[PDB]
Amino acid sequence: SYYIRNIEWEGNTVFPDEALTEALGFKKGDPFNRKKLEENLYGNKRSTDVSSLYMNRGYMLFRAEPTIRVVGGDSLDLHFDVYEGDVFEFGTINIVGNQKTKEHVIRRELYTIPGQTFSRDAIQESIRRLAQLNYFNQEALAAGPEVQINPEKKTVDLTYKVEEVGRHSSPQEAFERAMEFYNQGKYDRAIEYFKAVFTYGRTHEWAADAQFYLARAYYQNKEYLLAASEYERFIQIYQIDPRVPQAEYERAMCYYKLSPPYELDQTDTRKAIEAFQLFIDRYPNHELVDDATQKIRELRAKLARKQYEAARLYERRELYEAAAVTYEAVFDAYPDTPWADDALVGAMRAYIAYAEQSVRARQPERYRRAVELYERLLQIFPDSPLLRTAEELYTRARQRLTE
Template identity: 25%
Template structure:
């Protein structure tokens, strides 16, 4: 009886395994679509903001016929949809591929602008979405890559419709990078590392001469020289601060009317 029971149990297990293997596999509905159909569905996904599907369909379209009628548009749309879907690495890879393959494409200015946007971080509020994030959490390398891409748009394609916005974002990036250095300088100052604070402030002044954050860099330098008992250097720095920012509250001792504290709140 035991052998019979064991045999029946094994037979039941084999039947279950066989049944599982017999289940129909999920098919890819796009496999039977024509390229025109796939392109239409990809465009619909793009128009509807279904970014994951949009990127998937355009990738499939490019893979089917990399040198065909839809290939170039598919490549740039993969980059855009991946970026909107939060897949920055995939987006950057796709736009780089487009730039390398089609350097003379009519939309090459847009490709560089899109590359700049992929690396651009607007969480710090260029267009009114400022929410007080700590600049030390941002990625200066990504901001520099964004700046370089926007610079290509401004320098090589100044008449493109993307140039004015690219120029504005470049100005923001310069101050963001300067602010990153100033934030580091303030970090060192608050911990009593005055020489390190001076070095970081000087780096900001040297690399980002016209950035508004330079006002704070000079102030940190002045305070650090005072802490190091270097009154002459502190006075020299204050004269530079007064000459460059005559209305600075660090010089006048009075806050500007309607002025708000900087995000790092010295």
């Protein structure tokens, strides 16, 4: 049995020695207890431990190294060397895996808010809220979120992944009967006969046609993932057939048709963009490159809108720091999209609003970011329709900044 004598902290600046000792819960001279030491140093159930004191205030990389000293007989000295590190803010907060649940239902429940000081138990409490909805697998919820630490930028990005609970006698004949069904809109029947072509092998004169139109038939039947697989089969098997580029375009169209509304997970939207870009990269001289380029711009615009709507959501909540960083993220990630200039102005607007309710010491850097954004607007979108609205905001920021 040992008893606490002294407790000393080396490296602390944010908290006085007394605050950290009170968090440890050891009084001169209670009995020494390793489990209690571990809990109140690294993480207890009440988020009052030393580590939570720092990590709930942005110091994500805080680490305390303990050394135990027997200073004669029963006496026990505790010495902790403390690394505080930088203060971090939450950066991007993304939501994935929601194929049936709207994004805003998940985002509304999060305590982790973009632009706010990082907090460990904000993450932990967000996890528990999502678990309490009973929409998602709890064991998978207990694993995430996916974290990205940006030391240079002093930001921590988060992605919460959710898992929701809940006839013929020859190949030519078969091909011709399929095309008859295909041209009548009987795609299910055409599919059957296109597959029948290959009961005679897959290297005869009608194999490539049958494979190519089997995919189109699946597509017209709105079986896009099966169509995509048959397009891929065509591309890899009939590699020098002149329709290989067309097949790659039509494979991308399958994912274009699978691309869901912005409120939902955007995996297939990203797969559609990659498939179109791959078609363009391999066949830049093809006729359909311009249409593929327009399809990519439609899909990027949806990605941008998804994030732009998250910013609007924070703005309605008067969380202007979250709105500002989310708006600016839209510009940084999708400057080529229609939402780019709207987002710049929304970010200006939110940064200005956040500066008004902020401590005077931190207002300069917020107003200045608005100014820098306006100077970017003029360069990237010289004839933007939002210039006048932006200039008015630029005025206020520059007037208040000098003061």
